[PDB]
Amino acid sequence: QVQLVQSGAEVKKPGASVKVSCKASGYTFTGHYMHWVRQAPGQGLEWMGWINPYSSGTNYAQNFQGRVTMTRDTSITTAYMELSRLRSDDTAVYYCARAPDYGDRWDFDYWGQGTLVTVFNQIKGPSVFPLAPAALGCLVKDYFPEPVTVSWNSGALTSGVHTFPAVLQSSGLYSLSSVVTVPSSLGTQTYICNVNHKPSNTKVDKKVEP
Amino acid sequence: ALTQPPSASGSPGQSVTISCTGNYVSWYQQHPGKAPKVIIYEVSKRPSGVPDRFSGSKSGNTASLTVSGLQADDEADYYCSSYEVFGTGTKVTVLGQPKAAPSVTLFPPSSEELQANKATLVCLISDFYPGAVTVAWKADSSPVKAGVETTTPSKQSNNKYAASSYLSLTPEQWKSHRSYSCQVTHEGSTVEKTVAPT
């Protein structure tokens, strides 16, 4: 049987390097090409390159040339792929896939379980800005890492509160929005959003009014 | 270089068609939190284990993947690949629960944020099934790609999906443009929310 078992999950920092293995068994290691494809969380597949296990020749992608190196080991039948100058946008799951045969080299009939890389970087106190209305909320922008606890009136209001999931920005910082539904009542009730981020020890209360 | 429809869905037992506009064509099925698997190779051929209810074709510059007799396992992402180029992807849903139109709420940048030389358009989408939207920001009728950061749908507490999209803008361009819009498409259903400064 054909199996592709990769290395465990890794955490790196901006500028660091990570090496991912791909253990192969049950087939001719040097008779089929090995390809590496990455996929960011919530994004599509992106081909990175292929390496011939026989002649150790590689054909990297244009956008990854000069940054990715692919090697192979005949004795342990393991393919390797090392990427340098990692950034916050390089957080992706990396799979190693096998070319089915000699003639067909792109219909990957076997895939690995994947190796999640988590390029890690600057923590930061969140920036809270009110969202005037009806619906009113608060914007938790440029914070890292997850999670952030958002409440209203120190937990007095819990109905109609929707804490939307944060977005992984291109800068590596998350942005979360939590809003409430009100009869609009705006002039009578006072609304204050309490955001607490334990990793950076930041707790700021902002009052939202029209 | 391969374009796919953002969303496509059908009831259990229906059939759906997924386009791929860009040689051979191959398709992949990827369940959430799982590795992609080949279901279609060499235009229309199928590997072992793929049931006969999967089929493909190509007529001109566009190839189509059709799944007949939809099952719960078919609810997954689907991509078309030509050699090394991969498509945008298509989200397939077996209409598990009753359909629900998305709810859209758009918030302009706050006064406090503008004082810090920053501006962000917060567009919020909630209570929509299937979980697949198409957000395209419009600046006086012209779409803008830079600064667009859109999440992926996630399960709510009521079996529906929620998502959020943000358009980061500078104060100078926010004031220059007359208005901005958050157009979201849910399988051909486009609803536009427009906000304007001041």
Residue numbers in the entry:
A (entry chain P): 1 to 52, 52A, 53 to 82, 82A, 82B, 82C, 83 to 100, 100A, ...
B (entry chain R): 3 to 9, 11 to 25, 31 to 91, 96 to 210
Which passages does the manuscript contain on this structure?
In a double-blinded, placebo-controlled phase 1 human clinical trial, the recombinant, germline-targeting envelope glycoprotein (Env) trimer BG505 SOSIP.v4.1-GT1.1, adjuvanted with AS01B, induced bnAb precursors of the VRC01-class at a high frequency in the majority of vaccine recipients. These bnAb precursors, that target the CD4 receptor binding site, had undergone somatic hypermutation characteristic of the VRC01-class.
Moreover, VRC01-class bnAbs have very distinct and targetable genetic and structural characteristics. Finally, GT1.1-induced VRC01-class mAbs are structurally extremely similar to VRC01-class bnAbs.
